Amino acid sequence: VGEALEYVNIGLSHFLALPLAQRISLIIIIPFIYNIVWQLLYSLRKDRPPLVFYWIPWVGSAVVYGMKPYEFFEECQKKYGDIFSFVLLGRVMTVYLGPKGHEFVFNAKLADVSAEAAYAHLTTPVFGKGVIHDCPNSRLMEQKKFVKGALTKEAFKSYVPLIAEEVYKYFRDSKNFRLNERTTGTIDVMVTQPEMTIFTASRSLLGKEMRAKLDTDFAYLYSDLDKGFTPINFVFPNLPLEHYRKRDHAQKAISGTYMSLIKERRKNNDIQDRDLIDSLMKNSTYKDGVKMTDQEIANLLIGVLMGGQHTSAATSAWILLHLAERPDVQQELYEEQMRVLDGGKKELTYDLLQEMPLLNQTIKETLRMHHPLHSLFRKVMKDMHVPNTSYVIPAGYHVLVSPGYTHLRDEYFPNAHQFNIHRWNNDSASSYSVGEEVDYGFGAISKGVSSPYLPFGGGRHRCIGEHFAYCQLGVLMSIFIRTLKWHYPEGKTVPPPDFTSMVTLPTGPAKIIWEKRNPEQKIGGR
C-alpha cells in the first residue's frame, strides 16, 4: 500500500501534465460523474426524503421549477409523496406539500428555521438596510407591530374615500380610460393595475405629499426600484450593471424623499394620524429602548409599499381577467352593489364593504386560484425531524412550503381549476382563526396553520397587510363594477401565470375591453 500511495502522487502529477483540451473536459465531466454517483448513494438513505434526480450539477431542477413549479410539484408528488427534496441553483430544497407541510414550515420553531437568512439578498438590496430581512427576527416582529398600528378599522374608515378618489381620478385622467371622453377602450391590465395600485396605496399609506410626488418624474424612480425586485437577486443581488445602479440610486432617492418629509414633519411638529408615516414617527421604539432611525423608517415604508404593490396589483389584474369571461359574475356583483349602496345613492364606506360578501368572495376565490407567492422558503438552522417519518432535514437545507399548490388540489377544493366565487358562501371572510390563538409580537393570530387555504401564510411571518389588501381591492373592484363592464377580445381567455417573476402575475399582454355602464356619466374635479 506504500507502493499504492506512491502511484497516487504519480497520478496527481500525470494529471497536471494533461493537454488542456482533456482537462477542461476533465474538470467538467468529473463533477458530472460524481454528482450522479452521489445521488445514487443518497437515494439509499432512509433518514432523508427522496431527492429529485437531476443531470446538471449545481443547476439542478432549477429550469423546470422556475417555469412550472406546480406541474413540477405534481409530478414529484405522484412519484415520491408529499415530502421530497430537489437541488436548485446550489441549494437543496425540501418540499412538504399539503396542510401537514403548512404546519411543518409555517409553525416551525424560531431556533429551527430562518426566513431572513433565505430572503436577505432578495429584499435588502431593494428596501435598504436595518429592516424586514436585514435584522434579527424580534426586530421584524416589532416592525410588523409598528405597521399594524396604522392598519386599524378607523384607519380603513378614513382610507376608503381616499382610495375611491384615486380610482375615479385614474378613470378620469389616465390615457388608459379617459371616461369623460371615451365610452369604450382596450387596456393591458398589467399596465393599469400596477399604476392604480401605487396611486391608491401611496395616497392612503404614505399620505398626500408622497401621492403628489407621483405626478412628477419622481414616479420614474419607483419603476427603477421595482426592477430590482427580481428573482435574479437570489443569485446576483449586486452586479456592476446599470440595472443595479438605477435600483440603488432609486432606493437612496426614494428613502431620501421619505426622510425629508419625516424630518420636515418633526421640524414643524406636524405629526397627527394621517398616514403610516405619522404612525411610524410616533410608534417606532423597540422593546429594548432603541428607536428606528429615519433611514430605517423610510426603508420599512419602501418594503411594505413595494411588497403590497406587487401582491395587490397582480391580484386585481387576475380579478379583472377572470371576470372578463364571466359576465354572470359581473352581473351578480353589480346587483350586490345596487342593493348594498341603495342604487348608488349611498356613499361607499368601510362598513358597507363588509356588507358585500360576493365581492369579498371574488377576492377570496382569486387568491385561491392565484396565490401571488407560489413558494415560501426558510433556511434550516438546526436538524429537523419530520414527524411520523424517519426523515431528518439537516441544517444548511432549505424547506419550501406552497399553500398555492394546495389551493389548486381537487381533494381540498372540488373542481379546483374552475373559478367559482360561490364555493365561499357563508365563508366570505379574508381568513379566520377558529381555534386557539398566539402572539409572536404583532398581535394574536391563529395557532394552527393546517388550513388548506393560506393566501396570507401563517406563523410568525404571517401577513399583516391582509385587511388593507381587502380594503384596497374591495374599494377598487366596487368602483370597477359600478362603473364598467368588460370582456375579452375575440378568441382570448384567461392567460397562464408567469411563475418566473417575483409574484405569479399574468402572462402579458393581458388585454380586456371595457365599456361604461353609463356612457353619459362624468367624473368631476380638475
Ligand X SMILES: OC(Cn1cncn1)(Cn1cncn1)c1ccc(F)cc1F
Residues 362, 333 contacting (CB under 8 angstroms): yes
The stretches of 52-207 forming alpha helices (DSSP H) are 62-67, 69-80, 99-106, 115-127, 137-148, 153-173, 189-201
The 8-class DSSP code of residue 413 comes to S
Q: What are phi and psi of 116, to 5 degrees?
A: -65, -35
307 near ligand X (CB under 6 A): yes
Choose, by CB under 6 A, the member of 99, 308, 403, 474 that binds ligand X: 308
Which option in ligand HEM, ligand X, none does residue 367 bind, with CB closer than 5 to 8 A by kind? ligand HEM
What Cα–Cα distance (Å) separates residue 10 from each residue in 3, 23, 381?
Answer: 11, 17, 42
Stretch that binds ligand X, among 154-162, 239-247, 261-269, 298-306 (CB under 6 A): 298-306
Please pick, from the candidates 117, 259, 416, 464, the single residue that binds ligand HEM as defined by CB under 6 A: 464
In the complex, minimum distance from the CB of residue 387 to ligand HEM, in angstroms, rounded to a whole number: 20
Using the minimum distance from each CB to ligand X, give the nearer residue, 118 or 179. Answer: 118
459 binds ligand X (CB under 6 A): no
**Binding-site partner at residue 502 among ligand HEM, ligand X, none, CB < 5 to 8 Å by type:** ligand X
Does 304 help bind ligand X (rule: CB under 6 A)? yes
Among 311, 362, 375, 504, binds ligand HEM (CB under 6 A): 311
In the list 228, 303, 403, 506, the residue contacting ligand X (rule: CB under 6 A) is: 303
Q: Which stretch binds ligand X (CB under 6 A): 19-27, 90-98, 299-307, 378-386?
A: 299-307
* Shortest Cβ 58–ligand X spacing (Å): 22
Is residue 114 a contact point for ligand X (CB under 6 A)?
no
Residue 373 contacts ligand X per CB under 6 A? yes
Which C-beta is closer to ligand HEM: that of 303 or that of 495? 303
Partner from ligand HEM, ligand X, none binding residue 115, C-beta < 5-8 Å depending on class: ligand HEM
Cα separation, 379 vs 125, whole angstroms: 19
Q: How far apart are CA 219 and CA 107, in angstroms?
A: 39
Query: Using an 8 Å Cβ cutoff, are 485 and 143 in contact?
Result: no
Instruction: List Cα–Cα distances, 334 to 227, 338, 355, 503, in angstroms.
Output: 36, 6, 14, 29
User: Are 435 and 447 a contacting pair, CB within 8 Å?
Assistant: yes
| 315 binds ligand HEM per the rule CB under 6 A | yes
* The three-state (H, E, C) secondary structure of 440-506, written as one string: CCCCEEECCCCCCCCCCCCHHHCCCCHHHHHHHHHHHHHHHHHHEEEECCCCCCCCCECCCCCCCCE
User: What is the CB neighbour count within 10 angstroms for residue 384?
Assistant: 21
328: Cα separation from own chain's centroid:
29
Q: How far is the CB of 319 from ligand HEM (least distance, A)?
A: 10
Whichever of 48 and 368 has its CB closer to ligand X, that residue is: 368
Task: Give contact residues for ligand X (rule: CB under 6 A).
Answer: 123, 132, 303-304, 306-308, 311, 373, 463, 465, 502
